Design a protein around this ligand. Sequence first.
Ligand SMILES: [Cu+]
Length: 149
Amino acid sequence: MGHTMPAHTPPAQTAPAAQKAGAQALPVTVQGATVAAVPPSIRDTAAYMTLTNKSDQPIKLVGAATPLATSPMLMTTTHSGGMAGMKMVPWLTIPARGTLTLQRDGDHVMLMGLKRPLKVGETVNITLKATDGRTLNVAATVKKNIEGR
Ligand SMILES: [Cu+]
């Protein structure tokens, strides 16, 4: 039509790269979970991962169910993650900007009470459950990673 494309006009950027840009929303855990094959600290263990928020909404993740650990307990001791308490919290709400790093003693999930023997290099499914109404299946890679450190 003049400049009615097609096309957009658009592209001085600003269709971007859309595609996807405009975002829609990216469900705020574009992460490949890893779980530590038995630490030198009894069967109990944790996930080693990072929640990567790309939506900026107050999401509340409160599940980490898996044929791995019996007692999946949420924990939070990083002053930018959930909280400052390495304790069995409710869960961790990510008040937008959930760019927190789940590490053994710096906010995490304690996948406590290991059921069955694990191989460093295996992979077991995890089903997370945010009470925003998510029930998301993810592949969790079973390897200790920088442990006995
Ligand atoms: Cu912990």
